[PDB]
């Protein structure tokens, strides 16, 4: 079998976490432009027949609870799972509105042994976030 | 008949490890702009990895930062596809 089975009754969920406004105590800037991203993604995955759920400005606690809950849903009749994270970040880390959370903590809920109704199904994480503070100066060619 | 518990994940990162990722205040992030455009054009025809490779090329060639701060001006970005997938993925 060389291609994932994509003809289940449902394509699956597309969870979009759009963090624009951060607690001033974090020092993080407002992410102007992310609402445009979030609406673009909703329309894009809608036309791919995903059940899209947009969540806005979640704390690190709400991110973990959302992911936990979604991973415990019954995905048996779904082909795949998509999660889009739009926020600030560092290497290995995505920011809730009030502080950091390890990406590995989020993706671990969907591990093959921990979300059995997604075992063998593609689990797609799309991450718009910084991964550090290096800048690519590019090369002219 | 076991599979790895880490199998069948794909992480489509907007930028390389260690780097900033760029966002336009009016049009959105370079990566998401490009991803939505290529899914729209190619999801009925191309395998997902080839779609994401076209996203890489679009981000790498069509975007360059504009900033009043010279430190942040004229910068570039390459996304980073991380696949633990075991099969090809077609959205149709």
């Amino acid at each position: 079998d060389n291609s994932y089975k994509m003809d289940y009754p449902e394509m699956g969920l597309c969870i979009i976490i759009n963090n624009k406004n951060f607690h001033k105590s974090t020092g993080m800037t407002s992410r102007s432009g992310t609402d445009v991203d979030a609406a673009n993604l909703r329309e894009t995955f809608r036309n791919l027949k995903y059940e899209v759920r947009n969540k806005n400005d979640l704390t690190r606690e709400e991110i973990v609870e959302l992911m936990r809950d979604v991973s415990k849903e019954d995905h048996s009749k779904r082909s795949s799972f998509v999660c889009v994270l739009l926020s600030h970040g560092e290497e290995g880390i995505i920011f809730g509105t009030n502080g950091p959370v390890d990406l590995k903590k989020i993706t671990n809920f969907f591990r093959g042994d921990r979300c059995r109704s997604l075992t063998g199904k593609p689990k797609l994480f799309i991450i718009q976030a910084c991964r550090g503070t290096e800048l690519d100066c590019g090369i002219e060619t | 008949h076991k599979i790895p518990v880490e199998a069948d994940f794909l992480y489509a990162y907007s930028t390389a490890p260690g780097y900033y990722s760029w966002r336009n205040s009016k049009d959105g992030s370079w990566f998401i702009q490009s991803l939505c455009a290529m899914l729209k054009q190619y999801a009925d025809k191309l395998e997902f990895m080839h779609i994401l490779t076209r996203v890489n090329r679009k981000v790498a060639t069509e975007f360059e930062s504009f900033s009043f701060d010279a430190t942040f001006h004229a910068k570039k970005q390459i996304p980073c596809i991380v696949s633990m997938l075991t099969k090809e993925l077609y959205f149709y």
């Binding site: - | 900033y20 966002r23 336009n24 504009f66």
Partner: peptide, 5 residues
Amino acid sequence: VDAVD
């Protein structure tokens, strides 16, 4: 116009 995440 362009900002970092």
